Design an enzyme around this catalytic site. Structure first.
Site, PDB file in Angstrom:
ATOM      1  N   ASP A  99       0.967  -0.762  -0.219  1.00 22.14           N
ATOM      2  CA  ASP A  99      -0.275  -0.277  -0.258  1.00 22.14           C
ATOM      3  C   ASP A  99       0.862   1.070   0.139  1.00 22.14           C
ATOM      4  O   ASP A  99       1.662   1.644   0.899  1.00 22.14           O
ATOM      5  CB  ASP A  99      -1.159  -0.068   1.014  1.00 22.14           C
ATOM      6  CG  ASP A  99      -1.647   0.843   1.422  1.00 22.14           C
ATOM      7  OD1 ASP A  99      -2.393   1.426   0.175  1.00 22.14           O
ATOM      8  OD2 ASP A  99      -2.187   1.711   2.395  1.00 22.14           O
ATOM      9  N   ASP A 101      -1.339   5.138  -5.313  1.00 20.65           N
ATOM     10  CA  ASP A 101      -1.816   4.433  -4.582  1.00 20.65           C
ATOM     11  C   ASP A 101      -1.899   3.537  -4.276  1.00 20.65           C
ATOM     12  O   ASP A 101      -3.019   2.474  -5.196  1.00 20.65           O
ATOM     13  CB  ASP A 101      -3.298   5.250  -3.997  1.00 20.65           C
ATOM     14  CG  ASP A 101      -3.871   4.629  -2.405  1.00 20.65           C
ATOM     15  OD1 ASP A 101      -2.293   3.441  -2.368  1.00 20.65           O
ATOM     16  OD2 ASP A 101      -4.267   4.677  -2.196  1.00 20.65           O
TER      17      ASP A 101
HETATM   18  C1  AXF Z   1      -3.340   7.020   7.798  1.00 18.79           C
HETATM   19  C2  AXF Z   1      -3.721   8.286   6.663  1.00 18.79           C
HETATM   20  C3  AXF Z   1      -3.523   7.449   5.477  1.00 18.79           C
HETATM   21  C4  AXF Z   1      -4.678   6.638   4.586  1.00 18.79           C
HETATM   22  N1  AXF Z   1      -4.414   6.092   3.162  1.00 18.79           N
HETATM   23  C5  AXF Z   1      -5.377   6.087   2.513  1.00 18.79           C
HETATM   24  O1  AXF Z   1      -7.178   6.124   2.981  1.00 18.79           O
HETATM   25  C6  AXF Z   1      -5.227   6.378   1.352  1.00 18.79           C
HETATM   26  C7  AXF Z   1      -5.840   7.484   0.526  1.00 18.79           C
HETATM   27  C8  AXF Z   1      -5.821   4.601   1.385  1.00 18.79           C
HETATM   28  C9  AXF Z   1      -5.414   3.730   1.310  1.00 18.79           C
HETATM   29  O2  AXF Z   1      -4.269   3.065   0.218  1.00 18.79           O
HETATM   30  C10 AXF Z   1      -6.260   2.312   1.264  1.00 18.79           C
HETATM   31  C11 AXF Z   1      -5.545   0.710   1.549  1.00 18.79           C
HETATM   32  S1  AXF Z   1      -6.490  -0.449   1.655  1.00 18.79           S
HETATM   33  C12 AXF Z   1      -7.165  -0.582   3.366  1.00 18.79           C
HETATM   34  C13 AXF Z   1      -8.146  -1.599   3.650  1.00 18.79           C
HETATM   35  C14 AXF Z   1      -9.449  -1.540   2.111  1.00 18.79           C
HETATM   36  C15 AXF Z   1     -10.666  -2.688   2.115  1.00 18.79           C
HETATM   37  S2  AXF Z   1     -11.024  -2.619  -0.146  1.00 18.79           S
HETATM   38  C16 AXF Z   1      -8.921  -2.644  -0.694  1.00 18.79           C
HETATM   39  C17 AXF Z   1      -8.631  -4.150  -0.465  1.00 18.79           C
HETATM   40  C18 AXF Z   1      -8.377  -5.284  -1.700  1.00 18.79           C
HETATM   41  C19 AXF Z   1      -8.956  -3.768  -2.787  1.00 18.79           C
HETATM   42  N2  AXF Z   1      -9.553  -2.546  -2.669  1.00 18.79           N
HETATM   43  C20 AXF Z   1      -9.124  -2.149  -2.288  1.00 18.79           C
HETATM   44  C21 AXF Z   1      -9.563  -0.722  -1.581  1.00 18.79           C
HETATM   45  O3  AXF Z   1      -9.967  -0.169  -3.043  1.00 18.79           O
HETATM   46  N3  AXF Z   1      -8.477   0.195  -0.519  1.00 18.79           N
HETATM   47  C22 AXF Z   1      -9.177   1.716  -0.905  1.00 18.79           C
HETATM   48  C23 AXF Z   1     -10.507   2.022  -0.366  1.00 18.79           C
HETATM   49  C24 AXF Z   1      -8.421   2.106   0.593  1.00 18.79           C
HETATM   50  O4  AXF Z   1      -9.075   2.531   0.915  1.00 18.79           O
HETATM   51  N4  AXF Z   1      -6.780   1.778   0.386  1.00 18.79           N
END
Ligand code: AXF
Length: 375
Positions: A35, A218
């Site tokens: 990630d 990402d």
């Molecule tokens: C602490 C601050 C950092 C936070 N960073 C973020 O939120 C990023 C913008 C997104 C992330 O890269 C974050 C990490 S994966 C967490 C699990 C999701 C279930 S679903 C995930 C896994 C399976 C395939 N689809 C994915 C997806 O599509 N995820 C998006 C929806 C998301 O959310 N990703």
């Protein structure tokens, strides 16, 4: 020595890509989601319906408790757990062992996916967005400090496994030239989009709109995510280009899936998307061209049909642009942290259209690129 890291990733776009890691002494094997949108290393550490295995701190002689809690929310999903440290290795990565921060996940919501085959997450971004604050050193920062691994990694995500080259660039994974865009700020892998074209037509928006309120790369997000105004302009354009056929409006929300008889998907009616990124020299940019085979994610048919079904993998965002896995598939992406830049090249595992090809092209001239960053 990178041949041993080729193909060290498994997984799809809608399931996440994962690498095998080991934690503790004796080593405990776990599959870890890669990630680039976050900075916390966390693993399931308690039973869960969707976990076939998890991290057992009690069995590790090298575990050390940090006696501090942690909570991490994502765009979707969230977890909380206990901080600690342990020895970590990457079997199909560099031949090293590091003491890394580990968040032992004790409770979660909409984080673990049923049957995804991964049990944790590897946040590869910078300390600035780490929880609880930037003093929890991220895994890659630890790896670079404690070993001789150079400060960069590259990702080759292949659609319908992949490779994470830790510490370098593997020239056999891409063709043509690498084009670099500056990392605007070390928190997310933030970049600046300076122009958008659909089928060669400029969307003609204030370029600040493209990066409102940020644009990030990402690997942990499935879709291409666009800010409201850009998403609406893109969807309107893609609809007009494909108005030959009729689609439910729930298809354009990424909910309902469209289907076609096996081998009859009408790729030609869907446009290519060109994202222009700020380049390395003054007034210079370059573009990456996205084929419909990237933003139409193939999904399993909800019936007993031998048809080809897809979901629309472009969705609206309220937190800026996200260049997710469906964009990264088909490019080789270099996270050159040492030189504060991100490189793109056509991947060796690119999807084949018949008349069109995904591309990375430059140079282009673009005036006033600095004004495209949102503040
Ligand atoms: C602490 C601050 C950092 C936070 N960073 C973020 O939120 C990023 C913008 C997104 C992330 O890269 C974050 C990490 S994966 C967490 C699990 C999701 C279930 S679903 C995930 C896994 C399976 C395939 N689809 C994915 C997806 O599509 N995820 C998006 C929806 C998301 O959310 N990703």
């Amino acid at each position: 020595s990178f041949v041993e890291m080729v193909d060290n990733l498994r997984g799809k776009s809608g399931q996440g890509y994962y690498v095998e890691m080991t934690v503790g002494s004796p080593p405990q094997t776990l599959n870890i989601l890669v990630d680039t949108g976050s900075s916390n290393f966390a693993v399931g550490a308690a039973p869960h319906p969707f976990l076939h295995r998890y991290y057992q701190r009690q069995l590790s002689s090298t575990y050390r408790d940090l006696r501090k809690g942690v909570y991490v929310p994502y765009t979707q999903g969230k977890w909380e757990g206990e901080l600690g440290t342990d020895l970590v290795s990457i079997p199909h990565g560099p031949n090293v062992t590091v003491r890394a921060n580990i968040a032992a996940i004790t409770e979660s919501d909409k984080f673990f996916i049923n049957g995804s085959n991964w049990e944790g997450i590897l946040g590869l971004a910078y300390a600035e967005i780490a929880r609880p604050d930037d003093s929890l050193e991220p895994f890659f920062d630890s790896l670079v400090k404690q070993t001789h691994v150079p400060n960069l990694f590259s990702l080759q995500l292949c659609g319908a496994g992949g490779s994470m080259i830790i510490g370098g660039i593997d020239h056999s994974l891409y063709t043509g030239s690498l084009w670099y865009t500056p990392i605007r700020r070390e928190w997310y892998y933030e970049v600046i989009i300076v122009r958008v074209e659909i089928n060669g037509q400029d969307l003609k928006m204030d370029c600040k709109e493209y990066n409102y309120d940020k644009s990030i790369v990402d690997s942990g997000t499935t879709n291409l995510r666009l800010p409201k105004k850009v998403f609406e302009a893109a969807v309107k354009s893609i609809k007009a280009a494909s108005s030959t056929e009729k689609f439910p409006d729930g298809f354009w929300l990424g909910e309902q899936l469209v289907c076609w008889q096996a081998g009859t998907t009408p790729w030609n009616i869907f446009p290519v998307i060109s994202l222009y990124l700020m380049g390395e020299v003054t007034n210079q940019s370059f573009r990456i061209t996205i084929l419909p085979q990237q933003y139409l994610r193939p999904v399993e048919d909800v019936a007993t049909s031998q048809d080809d079904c897809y979901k629309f993998a472009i969705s609206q965002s309220s937190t800026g642009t996200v260049m997710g896995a469906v964009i990264m598939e088909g490019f080789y992406v270099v996270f050159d942290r040492a030189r504060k830049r991100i490189g793109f090249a056509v991947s060796a595992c690119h999807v084949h259209d018949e008349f069109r090809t995904a591309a990375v092209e430059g140079p282009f001239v673009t005036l006033d690129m600095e004004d495209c960053g949102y503040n």
